[PDB]
Design a binder for this molecule. Structure first.
Ligand SMILES: Nc1ncnc2c1ncn2[C@@H]1O[C@H](COP(=O)(O)OP(=O)(O)NP(=O)(O)O)[C@@H](O)[C@H]1O
Ligand SMILES: Nc1ncnc2c1ncn2[C@@H]1O[C@H](COP(=O)(O)OP(=O)(O)NP(=O)(O)O)[C@@H](O)[C@H]1O
Ligand SMILES: Nc1ncnc2c1ncn2[C@@H]1O[C@H](COP(=O)(O)OP(=O)(O)NP(=O)(O)O)[C@@H](O)[C@H]1O
Ligand SMILES: [Mg+2]
Ligand SMILES: [Mg+2]
Ligand SMILES: [Mg+2]
Lengths: 484, 470, 53, 469
């Protein structure tokens, strides 16, 4: 019966051409008699082009191939928390069966125009530079982009670690469940990353979806999509999930391999014609739902790897045009001491202050514009010319503000800790302190604030805003510390 | 019904091949339909392959399609409802309401493919559209019933610009508007729709003055390739049969060319330069030449035009310029300095900047503003290496006036208030001319730079100057 | 005496600046012509791969 | 009774073979054709349909005639494993090439095998001292980790690998495997002799190292597989003997390049730059086997050739993420006389963490990098305008950076002939204190030349004294 089964005509490179399967659906999952699974991508007049989810060493000509009558899906639900799975939802951590709430297709239409509401809730990364200058909101997509080894994973990792603050509480609406997608990475690197998540007690609210270097192209292609359906469960059920795609550069390379092996005619740099679509339907699924749909949200931090700083290249241009903003990392700034190595001039969050704690906003008034004024002023002074009060003051302030934003890894700060630092910077309380001492000032100011002005901190954390009275209290609390 | 049937024979991504019986093939550009468990899938016929098989482009995802499935010919091209019943409604590429508000009970439907107006049907006109934006009104004024393009790289300000124009031009205008979202962010759509309601441009329980059409970047290439024509057909009906002034906003038109590009290889075509389709220019022609004023009615169109990697020489935007009566070119370099709107004052152009149209006085200020600006661009290499000290007496004065002019060209938009915290300002064309004239004559040389930044007319400059000194 | 000494020092600094810069120009012209060549080739290659199918 | 086929087609390294009845050899199986020389080995790559298979040859295909008889061996290419391989030179196909007779090992293992799962991974942050200043200070290697040496033609990949062998292999305790991939036969001959002299190979005794060679004179099939061969030997030591193995590969870029020589003949549409579409996953199937697991540990040092000095090339570019530490050698730096030509700002390691090396070491490494970056950011101004136009801070920082840069050079024992000076091995702790002091401006009065091509700070002081005469 050629309708529900077929035979292999030819097989090689993770592709199989199958005669028969007359009733198969485009993108349907199939089972090979030899063991390995596969996906139907090319439905042609004489045959079916199938991309395998594993090795092909065991498939041969003549082999029987069997329908499943299912479009490629995956298990979803809270059951997945604390688990490490492959692209198809199979547990790869050796901790037994996943309990699923249901199954969701890998490819799911994004929320249309109607079922959405403006992004208005902070995703607190705990990174001074991000949270003050490029605030990320619940439902937003914010690209992390940079050359190799520039701190890109470090920015998502610290974000996940910092959700510890709400995920231990019992308030479901303030919780953020994290999903981390590793595409093209090596297993030891993912192993190392789950170990860090455990040591920080962050694994209990994270889901890792892994399609690593050794796995078949079609698994790497699929992983972001199935991870999104995992994230989508939280979104559809009135909760919030944050998904990290590490990285989309590698997924695009994997899509490029499938398509060339299916002999679909290549486009620019040999990628498929619709490489832009691959990412755009991926990322539009990240969204902030309306009240009628239960206000759940999904937030995406896609990662893209440039080459030689070239943010003008094919895939980076594509993704930059999809997301709501980018964080831009650079080797030069890293070695200069600026860590995270965020390029402020180029780095934007488009939700901006709509999705930022008010207290943080209040204190970081024009910090971005000012740091821009500082960049200009510093560029000029490099002419070795003498300077006036105005130029020397801002050159002083900006130099300290830059220093203020440097931050160790795995060390995310609370909002109530960030506010007073930015405040002391922006209004100029740091201006008469030696530059090498800004690091020690940070911890000592906080230790002082935790001992004496602890009531101040609580107001900031619980209200999230600064009344005229709080500002006055904070003004005096800083001035007091500036002289021992 | 007298219905015609075929069978799916191939599915590769967006491309679907369909076999029909003898001498009853549907014509190229016909819509075909497949019944799906959810609703229906639309295909648009693209090629006749021979041997009674046609190649089609899907208007939705093809996942779940089976070889041998029945395909229905609809007899003509994708249709969309036209007329007043589209007002205050959101419509997708295939003419179907996507606002959950019921059917669009309009008297007529019309094909999204139509021939452009003949050469005899053209109507030339030199009437100025006052925007209230200083840089546009002074240096590259827009034309009533003309074609305006907003060129810009990722994140430079196209969408905010287009929103400002909607906010100023649309209320002052008395006819109807049509907004088309092509290949952009669905959440931009959700924002615009929420805005229109609060402004009253869309009243759910009454009359409305704008038609929304969306085909955003979540949608497959075929949808994104056709949705501009859907929005257009609605604007054409208002131009021709309603007989009145129509505004047509499109964000973003690049997405039409890009979508076209994404399927071109699977359609069977050798690529052209920079991986674009070989039909890039004729496809753009067929579409753009419909977006036009005729002797029957007026269409004023504003089209945002994305510019890949910031490269203005890239085939897509490069081909777009010549279709356009006035081009506003946005610039990363200008935005990075904190000047919004980031309009490049040298690269932006308008057919209307002619003494015969704006007057001699207006034209002279414009020229001299541009000369001052270019001199400054020219001298920037003497500044960077040898510094301001080395300049001539008359050169120092030109640089100081230029720096003021650069800043004076910036303006707080009403729609940009969340980004700035500055209340929006709208400035009359005549104040813009008078203001810049005074500056070029040296009437405000003693006033420092920051006083010209992010304000309105000249009275605002004077007011900021006194506030900074105190 | 300081003026005359300065102007002679600026003349000779500007002399070495011009010379060093004119050296860079050469090296960068050559890099330019390599790259111009490679862009034509790489662009042709895509066009050709797309025409093989 | 054995399964036979006939050759239907030969194009270069690719041979197509037809099989008469129902049973076809699995993908990855070795096939054989009897030549008057000896035997030619083929490896099944795909099933073409109509009972034909497509194979990749493991030697020259000169002489093959359509119609020739082909034997299925029943499984993949196999190699000798265990202790019997120590002190021996071996083929891509597992044969002895040192004219010392048969390698009589108990077991033979297939060269193709699944990488260790995610559950089998074992991670640790442990410094492996190398005695090389730039590495130890700025980008330390990890015991049981992966280490790539990236470099264009002739910048010093091999000499760097040789120095590592000389420093770490001599007293290591476990076993080493050396794999020559697509490199110079003469370097293989050099190495063999070198090991015999340093007593790491003993013809009469015991040996710590097993040699596997597929050099640049070999057809692309051999160059594409020989690394798997070296790897399988290494995996046996890791899993079965639970040992700390050292795996040296020179040069792994050549595995990929061999892969691309045959991609078109296999009927693929070329990817970017004419590489095989399978560049990334082919690389993972290999790279992911070279790892430490819970059973045992593998420290690997891979030379990575950079074609046309282009680090963005798909081969090197994809290799980066497979490596725990990367030292990138630079032609710019080597043309200035600085060896090893390491790029102190582009070389990276996962272990440069205060939690691993201590705050002091991290702080010093950071500040070295700051100093050098400040100098790098000023190249243009310097080249046009020169030192006189710098500010006073900058002039100091650059003067210090020029020393740190020279201080990062080191005489290597293996490079003695080119430097003219005896080689120096400097200890990690010495390196940290030396650089610490320079950063503190304690040697600002010392001429640059004294920092060039010496050991630690003492050598500097001693050289500064000699020159004062
Ligand atoms: N704020 C920080 N301060 C100091 N070091 C940091 C910081 N963030 C990251 N690093 C280190 O910098 C290196 C690169 O960080 P990582 O997040 O791996 O970047 P990446 O861009 O993902 N690199 P890769 O995927 O390897 O190309 C690692 O050694 C980090 O531990
Ligand atoms: N008038 C303005 N005033 C201040 N900031 C602005 C203005 N216009 C744009 N921006 C900044 O630019 C960002 C993007 O504006 P937007 O109009 O979306 O750019 P765009 O060119 O349409 N980007 P894209 O659609 O992604 O190509 C905003 O989030 C602001 O930060
Ligand atoms: N540590 C060193 N000290 C001094 N000279 C060196 C050093 N390393 C390499 N060289 C010089 O560089 C030449 C080549 O070094 P080698 O290790 O062969 O580099 P390579 O990058 O492996 N060359 P190839 O493999 O052909 O691209 C030698 O002839 C030496 O002159
Ligand atoms: Mg990373
Ligand atoms: Mg936009
Ligand atoms: Mg070498």
């Amino acid at each position: 019966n050629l309708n529900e089964t077929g035979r292999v005509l030819a097989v090689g490179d993770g592709i199989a051409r199958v005669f028969g399967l007359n009733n198969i659906q485009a993108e349907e999952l199939v089972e090979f008699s030899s063991g390995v699974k596969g996906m139907a991508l090319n439905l042609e007049p004489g045959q079916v082009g199938i991309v395998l989810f594993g090795s092909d060493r065991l498939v041969k000509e003549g082999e029987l191939v069997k329908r499943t009558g299912n479009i490629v899906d995956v298990p979803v639900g809270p059951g997945l928390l604390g688990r490490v799975v492959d692209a198809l939802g199979n547990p790869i951590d050796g901790k037994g069966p996943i309990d699923a709430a249901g199954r969701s297709r890998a490819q799911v239409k994004a929320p249309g125009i109607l079922p959405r509401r403006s992004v208005h809730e902070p995703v607190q990364t705990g990174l001074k530079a991000v949270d003050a200058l490029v605030p990320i909101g619940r439902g937003q997509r914010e690209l992390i982009i940079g050359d190799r080894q520039t701190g890109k994973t470090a920015v998502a990792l610290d974000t996940i670690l910092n959700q510890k603050r709400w995920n231990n509480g019992s308030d479901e609406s303030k919780k953020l469940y994290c999903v981390y997608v590793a595409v093209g990475q090596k297993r030891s690197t993912v192993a190392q990353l789950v170990q860090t998540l455990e040591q920080h007690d962050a694994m209990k609210y994270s889901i890792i979806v892994a399609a690593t270097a050794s796995e078949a192209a079609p698994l790497q292609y699929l992983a972001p999509f199935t991870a999104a359906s995992i994230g989508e469960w939280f979104r559809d059920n009135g909760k919030h999930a944050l998904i990290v795609y590490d990285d989309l550069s590698k997924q695009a390379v994997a899509y490029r391999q499938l398509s060339l092996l299916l002999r679909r005619p290549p486009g620019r740099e040999a990628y498929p014609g619709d490489v832009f679509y691959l990412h755009s339907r991926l990322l539009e699924r990240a969204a902030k739902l309306s009240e009628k749909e239960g206000s759940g949200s999904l937030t995406a931090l896609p990662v893209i790897e440039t080459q030689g700083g070239d943010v003008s290249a094919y895939i980076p241009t594509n993704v930059i045009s999809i997301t709501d903003g980018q964080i831009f990392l650079e080797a030069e700034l890293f070695y200069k001491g600026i860590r995270p190595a965020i390029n402020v001039g180029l780095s934007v969050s488009r939700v901006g202050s709509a999705a930022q704690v008010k207290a943080l906003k209040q204190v970081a008034g024009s910090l971005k514009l000012f740091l821009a004024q500082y960049r200009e002023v510093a560029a000029f002074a490099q002419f070795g010319s003498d300077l006036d009060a105005s130029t020397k003051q801002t050159l002083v302030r900006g130099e300290r503000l830059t220093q203020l934003l440097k931050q160790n890894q795995y060390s995310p700060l609370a909002t109530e800790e960030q506010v007073p630092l930015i405040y002391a910077g922006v209004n100029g309380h740091l201006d008469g302190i030696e530059l090498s001492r800004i690091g020690e000032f940070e911890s000592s100011f906080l230790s002082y604030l935790k001992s004496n002005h602890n009531e101040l901190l609580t107001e900031i954390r619980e209200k999230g805003e600064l009344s005229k009275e709080l500002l006055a209290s904070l003004k005096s609390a800083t001035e007091s510390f500036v002289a021992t | 019904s007298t219905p015609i049937t075929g069978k799916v024979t191939a599915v590769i991504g967006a491309i679907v091949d369909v076999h029909f019986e003898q001498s009853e093939l549907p014509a190229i550009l016909n819509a075909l339909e497949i019944k799906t468990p959810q609703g229906k899938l639309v295909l648009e016929v693209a090629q006749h392959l021979g041997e009674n098989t046609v190649r089609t482009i899907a208007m939705d995802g093809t996942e779940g399609l089976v070889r041998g499935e029945k395909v229905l010919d609809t007899g003509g091209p994708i249709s969309v409802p036209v007329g007043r019943e589209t007002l205050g409604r959101i419509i997708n590429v295939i003419g179907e309401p996507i606002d959950e508000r019921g059917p669009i009970k309009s008297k007529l439907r019309k094909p999204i493919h139509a021939d452009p107006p003949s050469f005899a049907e053209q109507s030339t006109s030199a009437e100025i559209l006052e925007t209230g934006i200083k840089v546009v009104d002074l240096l590259a004024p827009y034309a009533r019933g003309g074609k305006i393009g907003l060129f810009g790289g990722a994140g430079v300000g196209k969408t905010v610009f287009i929103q400002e124009l909607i906010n100023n031009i649309a209320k002052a205008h008395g006819g109807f508007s049509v907004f088309t979202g092509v290949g952009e962010r669905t959440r931009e759509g959700n924002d615009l729709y929420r805005e229109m309601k609060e402004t009253g441009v869309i009243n759910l329980e009454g009359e409305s003055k704008v038609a929304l059409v969306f085909g955003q970047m979540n949608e497959p290439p075929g949808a994104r390739a056709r949705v501009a024509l859907t929005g257009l057909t609605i604007a054409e009906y208002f131009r021709d049969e309603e007989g009145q002034d129509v505004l047509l906003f499109i964000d973003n038109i690049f997405r039409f060319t890009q979508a076209g590009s994404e399927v071109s290889a699977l359609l069977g075509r050798i690529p052209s330069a920079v991986g674009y389709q070989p039909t890039l220019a004729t496809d753009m022609g067929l579409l753009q030449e419909r977006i036009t004023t005729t002797k029957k009615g007026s269409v004023t169109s504003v089209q945002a035009v994305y510019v890949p990697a910031d490269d203005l020489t890239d085939p897509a935007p490069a081909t777009t310029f010549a279709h356009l009566d006035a081009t506003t070119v946005l610039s990363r370099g200008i935005s990075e300095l904190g000047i919004y709107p980031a309009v490049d004052p040298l690269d932006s152009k308008s057919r209307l900047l002619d003494a015969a149209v704006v007057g001699q006085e207006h034209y002279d200020v414009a020229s001299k503003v541009q000369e001052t600006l270019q001199t400054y661009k020219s001298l920037q290499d003497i500044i960077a290496i040898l510094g301001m000290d080395e300049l001539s007496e008359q050169d120092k004065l030109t640089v100081e006036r230029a720096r003021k002019i650069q800043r004076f060209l910036s303006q707080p938009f009403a729609v940009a208030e969340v980004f700035t915290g500055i209340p929006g300002k709208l400035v009359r064309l005549k104040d813009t001319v008078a203001s810049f004239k005074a500056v070029l004559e040296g009437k405000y040389d003693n006033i420092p730079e920051h006083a010209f930044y992010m304000v309105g007319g000249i009275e605002d400059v004077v007011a900021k100057a006194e506030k900074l000194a105190a | 005496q300081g003026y005359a000494a300065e102007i002679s020092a600026r003349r000779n600094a500007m002399d070495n600046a011009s010379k060093n810069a004119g050296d860079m120009i050469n090296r960068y012209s050559i890099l330019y012509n390599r790259t111009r060549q490679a862009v034509i080739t790489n662009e042709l290659v895509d066009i050709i791969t797309g025409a093989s199918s």
